[PDB]
Amino acid sequence: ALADVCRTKLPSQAQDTLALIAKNGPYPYNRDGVVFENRESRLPKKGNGYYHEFTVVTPGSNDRGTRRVVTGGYGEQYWSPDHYATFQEIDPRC
């Protein structure tokens, strides 16, 4: 049961991250692209290595912070402002 968000409504940092995803980087962190395990199953329960996580920069700071995009195996994209506590499916069509 998944909240949905239009790509245009995403903070501009989140959109930068999707742009880096679409050209496969370079990414600003070695941790970008690591397997997201979906341990809590807030996202569709899928096989090993389906999901990958990518940093969204906090505005102001250049630390990683708590903002993230998880991608799925067919290019589904998920937004998390709250360090994997909740997810919204990104609709790239709006």
Interacting residues with ligand BGC (CB under 6 A): 29-31
Q: How far apart are CA 90 and CA 6, in angstroms?
A: 6
Whether 8 and 16 have beta carbons less than 8 Å apart is answered as no
Q: Which one of the spans 10-18, 19-27, 34-42, 74-82 is the region binding ligand 3GP (CB under 6 A)? A: 34-42
Q: Which of 15, 38, 58, 88 binds ligand 3GP (CB under 6 A)?
A: 38
Q: Which of 39, 60, 61, 93 binds ligand 3GP (CB under 6 A)?
A: 39
Closest CA to 67 of 45, 47, 90, 92: 90
39 binds, among ligand 3GP, ligand BGC, none (CB under 5 to 8 A by kind): ligand 3GP
In DSSP terms, 80 is beta-bridged to: 68
